[PDB]
Amino acid sequence: NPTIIRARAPLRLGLAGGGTDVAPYADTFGGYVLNATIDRYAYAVIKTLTIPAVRFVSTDQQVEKHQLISEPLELNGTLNLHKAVYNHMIRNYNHGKPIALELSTFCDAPAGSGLGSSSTLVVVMIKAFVELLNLPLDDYAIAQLAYRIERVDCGLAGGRQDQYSATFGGFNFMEFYEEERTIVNPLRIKNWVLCELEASLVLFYTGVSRESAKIIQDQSDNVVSHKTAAIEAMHGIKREALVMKEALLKGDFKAFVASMRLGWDNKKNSARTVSNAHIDEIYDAAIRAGAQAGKVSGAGGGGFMLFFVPTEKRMDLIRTLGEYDGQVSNCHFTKNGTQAWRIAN
Amino acid sequence: NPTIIRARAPLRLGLAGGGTDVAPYADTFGGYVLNATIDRYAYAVIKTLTIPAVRFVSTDQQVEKHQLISEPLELNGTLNLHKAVYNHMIRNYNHGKPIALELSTFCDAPAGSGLGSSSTLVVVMIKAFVELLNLPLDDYAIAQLAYRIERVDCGLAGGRQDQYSATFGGFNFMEFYEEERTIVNPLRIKNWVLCELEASLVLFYTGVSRESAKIIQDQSDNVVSHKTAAIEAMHGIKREALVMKEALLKGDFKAFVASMRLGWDNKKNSARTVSNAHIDEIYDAAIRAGAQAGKVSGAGGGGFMLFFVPTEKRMDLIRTLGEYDGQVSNCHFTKNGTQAWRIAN
Ligand SMILES: [Cl-]
Ligand SMILES: [Cl-]
Ligand SMILES: [Cl-]
Ligand SMILES: [Cl-]
Ligand SMILES: [Cl-]
Ligand SMILES: [Cl-]
Ligand SMILES: [Cl-]
Ligand SMILES: [Cl-]
């Protein structure tokens, strides 16, 4: 009789500092990110099989099937992440002996949403295997493994914050240094501050961003090619992540919104495609309706936007955003990181 | 210097039994409802004023302003609920002496959403006053007061479940008897059951329902006018709420979905406008895409629908619903009831 495992990991809002976690910047100056997990999840399922095969199923429903071999699976460009997590687990915890199983994923947000889904999906696949094989991997180790699987094994360029939000959960201030050294600072925010923040945030999905890889490439180039003004914009991204972190610990909403405004300007100045005229139209309209600050959640170029609005103008802002292309949502934070459960055996 | 209070209360999904809480049925046979609060809120704010006036502001931004009188405010049909909560509090806890304040509300869902917003708004106004005046009102007393304010003071006909979900929070099985006697049974659902349920639910907002008052009138008439077959449909609504409650406590998803299917048929049979061809088109399409069961969340006729779908068909269902008019969402439950916090003094 088969075993069925599921795992989930929360997606995240980037509140401040995104862009300082790109490789050249973090390694050279040190990065800061402030982020927080929300009520939307990536999921992985492992089902053991009775036939001698391995099957991989993805969120946009790609599907690969292989027979049982004592060789690592080739990373041929179809479902490389699923195959790489599988390869790592078989090599390191099953003495290279294949396991007949189906590894499937799905997600509450599509690719390009600005919610860290790509890396959250790797975390959740790892967490399902942690449950399957009863592995003693702690949170730092799961997040580091996810990072290595995606960026080294699979050679995919990107940031360093999403692995940690998906694993740890809650509100975190992260410090990124050279040689893969990351410090996660879980923030002990007062209950009234959390309720006030949720009461003042409105989320707006603008559509799929296709700029992430480009923006991250540009931000990396800023440092490597010594683009002075753009590097200074990134230094401002960093400074404001710390100001925003302190504002939250102090329950200082005036400083929070001032820091989001300055941070949004810096983020736009760091890479050309972070914003565009369409996003700027939405932003301007939100501000007109009474929003005090806002930003694009991930690298930029589309995906989710978030707005800070005083409660007396919240419904006005909600009404206005209805006039634009996209979907409005409230913002609800989650405190828990990745978790797994069993359905059969 | 002024005082600023905010309160919030979670909205709810009706999982089973809705319709058995209408007055004639509950009073005659006893009602059962299974419901659960979600990650969307109604809000109230009280701001004390320095001028001698009282102001009321609503979710669709109606606004009323009065000067200070030692007479109860008239319920003239504009913002009656705000005025009635204010009248009750001034009479019973301030010896009839007016208080200069502004009472405002807003909500994460509009009227007719099938999420219990109308009554949740009354609860949250009450909770803001509990915080303002430091009242020792327990949960049963807040829910009962909300019920009386809406149905007696304001003479608005309706159900009995929403006041209790908004106040208590979490997953509750409620028993409704004659003479306003209600038993709330908070359900201790296992963590894996809650995660599995969220992983298997998809929400779909179909638009504003304008049928609530009609459906509740029809269900009440069923009992009063001895409409035999329609009363039997309501008896089936009741039976399946208990089966569904037991299925959740036992972690029995097969029984859960069987009970939702039988309960949806009964609900449709109890009142003519519970469903229509448009809702039925959506339902049929969801089932085609792989959903195993579903229903309209509130009284019926529109608002939110919820679907139970096995995880391997979840993305398919999500894609399909995209083809219809409405907005797809995941389902995240909240465990907490109504809560308040302070911003000034
Ligand atoms: Cl970000
Ligand atoms: Cl950011
Ligand atoms: Cl994303
Ligand atoms: Cl992202
Ligand atoms: Cl209901
Ligand atoms: Cl129901
Ligand atoms: Cl509603
Ligand atoms: Cl409702």
Author numbering:
A (entry chain B), B (entry chain B): 2 to 346
From the manuscript:
Furthermore, soaking of native crystals with glycerol or mannose showed that these two sugars both bind in the sugar-phosphate binding pocket, where the sugar is expected.
Here, we present the structure of WcbL from Burkholderia pseudomallei.
